[PDB]
Amino acid sequence: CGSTSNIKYTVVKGDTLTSIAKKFKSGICNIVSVNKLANPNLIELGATLIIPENCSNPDNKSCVSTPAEPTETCVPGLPGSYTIVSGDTLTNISQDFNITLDSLIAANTQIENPDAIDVGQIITVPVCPSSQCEAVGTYNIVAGDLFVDLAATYHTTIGQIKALNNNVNPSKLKVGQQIILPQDCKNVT
Amino acid sequence: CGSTSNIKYTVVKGDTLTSIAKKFKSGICNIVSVNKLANPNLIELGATLIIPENCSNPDNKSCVSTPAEPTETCVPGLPGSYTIVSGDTLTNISQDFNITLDSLIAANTQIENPDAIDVGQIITVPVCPSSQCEAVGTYNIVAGDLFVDLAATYHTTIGQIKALNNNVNPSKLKVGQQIILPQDCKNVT
Numbered sequence A, B: 001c002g003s004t005s006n007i008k009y010t011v012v013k014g015d016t017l018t019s020i021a022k023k024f025k026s027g028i029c030n031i032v033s034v035n036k037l038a039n040p041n042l043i044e045l046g047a048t049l050i051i052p053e054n055c056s057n058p059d060n061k062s063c064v065s066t067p068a069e070p071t072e073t074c075v076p077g078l079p080g081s082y083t084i085v086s087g088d089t090l091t092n093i094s095q096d097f098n099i100t101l102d103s104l105i106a107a108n109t110q111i112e113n114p115d116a117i118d119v120g121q122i123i124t125v126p127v128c129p130s131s132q133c134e135a136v137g138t139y140n141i142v143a144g145d146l147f148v149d150l151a152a153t154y155h156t157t158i159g160q161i162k163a164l165n166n167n168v169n170p171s172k173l174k175v176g177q178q179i180i181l182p183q184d185c186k187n188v189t
């Protein structure tokens, strides 16, 4: 990393390796390597990490697949709606659904100002015509499970998992917890 | 019906043939018969119906399958949560999910008083362990479609359709409207 110092750092609410790497001018993959993290997406609240700070040569690419900006304008299969929770923004919710912000705003012409939404407000999610998810049902959380990773494994999205578990905080999942998991969401015909 | 008079009546918000029959001391099936209604569950806002009033011999049974009080304590497959809309009560939401009121309250110990819920509040829906719906996706509304009837045809519940379309008023469905429809919800294994 060619860091100028190492700090031991305590992981707090809202942290990701991306946010940590940016705060300390480090690299995602250097933090992974130095701490022997099995999964760059998983860091536990209250854990200590060694962070190489102010790196001349940060690596943010080798260990992670950085997904591009969403380009789709609809979500396959479900849901028709999503309920706003504390901290949500239309930007982040569109990202979670892998759709453009523009498409989500367009689906919600009842919203007067897209930056003024309220906890408990229901928004429409634009669903692709002729689309479905194949088998939506119970799943028990195992150690290290994350919505981001389940979405990839099961061919869905973070947003779709959130909508089906809309009062579940993704950062507070417990081993054995039952969630509802959609699978294999796609256009058909 | 052995009515003592007939009134022409205009269907308004919240009406069902059950509520009309009770207001006018008529019978569901007599109103069906006299008005040549194809589907006892379907009466259109603003329609006129002939109602035989104050019947000595009301028929509320021959044309309808009156379902009993729910006895199940969980819903198969989905959803993890439901968002309260105007007019909702935990009694009616449990009925829509075909579960006991008791089970829904038990799933929601965060609610201090079950009679004081707010529009926009998110409640947990108790989902049966080891259960799924088979193919959740888009459906276009055709003339005369109702959530009550789609639930029966597709082996789901009114509540599950509502949760997947939580800002859709079931009384305001339009021909061609895309909704999200779960199917074949059951325990598995």
Ligand SMILES: CC(=O)N[C@@H]1[C@@H](O)[C@H](O[C@@H]2O[C@H](CO)[C@@H](O[C@@H]3O[C@H](CO)[C@@H](O[C@@H]4O[C@H](CO)[C@@H](O)[C@H](O)[C@H]4NC(C)=O)[C@H](O)[C@H]3NC(C)=O)[C@H](O)[C@H]2NC(C)=O)[C@@H](CO)O[C@@H]1O
Residues within 6 Å of the ligand: A011, A012, A013, A014, A015, A016, A017, A018, A019, A028, A040, A041, A042, A043, A044, A045, A046, A064, A141, A142, A143, A144, A145, A146, A147, A148, A149, A158, A169, A170, A171, A172, A173, A174, A175
């Ligand atoms: C490389 C990069 O920046 N990737 C990000 C990616 O990290 C984002 O995903 C979010 O990551 C955070 C951090 O890992 C997730 O929060 C963690 O969630 C898990 C599960 O709830 C928590 O684990 C629990 O931890 C406690 C101890 O604290 C243990 O007792 C529990 O057993 C344990 N549970 C399990 C099942 O193992 C962990 O504490 C949380 N950490 C923090 C800092 O909150 C968050 O869930 C995750 N978000 C989603 C939606 O999956 C991702 C966000 O989109 O972007 C990148 O891909």
Ligand SMILES: CC(=O)N[C@@H]1[C@@H](O)[C@H](O[C@@H]2O[C@H](CO)[C@@H](O[C@@H]3O[C@H](CO)[C@@H](O[C@@H]4O[C@H](CO)[C@@H](O)[C@H](O)[C@H]4NC(C)=O)[C@H](O)[C@H]3NC(C)=O)[C@H](O)[C@H]2NC(C)=O)[C@@H](CO)O[C@@H]1O
Residues within 6 Å of the ligand: B011, B012, B013, B014, B015, B016, B017, B018, B019, B028, B040, B041, B042, B043, B044, B045, B046, B064, B141, B142, B143, B144, B145, B146, B147, B148, B149, B158, B169, B170, B171, B172, B173, B174, B175
């Ligand atoms: C026997 C008995 O009491 N059964 C009840 C059952 O009626 C309950 O179900 C509710 O029924 C009401 C009344 O039929 C449903 O509301 C109607 O909904 C339809 C669809 O949205 C409306 O149709 C539209 O009408 C306008 C004109 O007004 C037309 O322009 C549209 O084309 C037309 N749309 C379609 C697709 O045809 C109709 O106006 C509504 N009527 C009223 C009075 O609101 C209501 O949706 C339905 N509820 C559900 C959840 O399905 C049922 C409730 O659980 O209990 C019994 O089984």
Ligand SMILES: *[C@@H]1O[C@H](CO)[C@@H](O[C@@H]2O[C@H](CO)[C@@H](O)[C@H](O)[C@H]2NC(C)=O)[C@H](O)[C@H]1NC(C)=O
Residues within 6 Å of the ligand: A067, A068, A070, A071, A072, A098, A156, A157
């Ligand atoms: C978000 O959507 C994009 C666009 O559909 C997805 O990227 C495409 O995935 C398909 C299916 O495997 C590939 O054929 C394309 O080549 C992918 N890239 C692009 C630029 O279109 C991407 O998978 C989705 N991201 C997430 C996180 O779900």
Ligand SMILES: *[C@@H]1O[C@H](CO)[C@@H](O[C@@H]2O[C@H](CO)[C@@H](O)[C@H](O)[C@H]2NC(C)=O)[C@H](O)[C@H]1NC(C)=O
Residues within 6 Å of the ligand: B067, B068, B070, B071, B072, B098, B156, B157
């Ligand atoms: C509500 O739940 C009850 C109980 O599961 C359902 O009634 C049963 O349906 C099964 C499956 O066909 C039958 O084998 C039972 O005989 C039924 N009756 C009883 C008393 O258990 C009923 O189908 C559900 N109602 C709705 C509207 O979904």
Ligand SMILES: *[C@@H]1O[C@H](CO)[C@@H](O)[C@H](O)[C@H]1NC(C)=O
Residues within 6 Å of the ligand: A072, A073, A074, A128, A129, A187
């Ligand atoms: C699914 O179909 C919709 C509707 O035509 C289209 O907009 C969308 O891009 C399709 N999705 C994919 C991944 O091809």
Ligand SMILES: *[C@@H]1O[C@H](CO)[C@@H](O)[C@H](O)[C@H]1NC(C)=O
Residues within 6 Å of the ligand: B072, B073, B074, B128, B129, B187
């Ligand atoms: C589904 O399984 C659950 C969990 O055991 C049980 O409570 C429920 O009654 C089952 N449903 C049916 C319809 O048999």
